[PDB]
Amino acid sequence: DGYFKIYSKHTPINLGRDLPQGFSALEPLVDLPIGINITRFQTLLALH
């Protein structure tokens, strides 16, 4: 509906395994009236 919604959570890891066992729900961070069309995405990495 024109909006783009970010939800997130940052959980600590005992250094056990990936996506640990347990439960934790993502809170809405931003809820943005961008209003455009999305069909694809990509991520930025930094280089020093």
Next chain:
Amino acid sequence: CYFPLRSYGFRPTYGVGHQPYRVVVLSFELLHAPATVCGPKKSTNLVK
């Protein structure tokens, strides 16, 4: 023949209908996607 037409003789004491009057215009046709300017919407005191 000329390209422009000269900028006015903006003399103050002569200028009556002929002095520079700065002007501003607002246009807001809606009929698009999101909401962007939705008035002051004032708040009355909270009764309990």
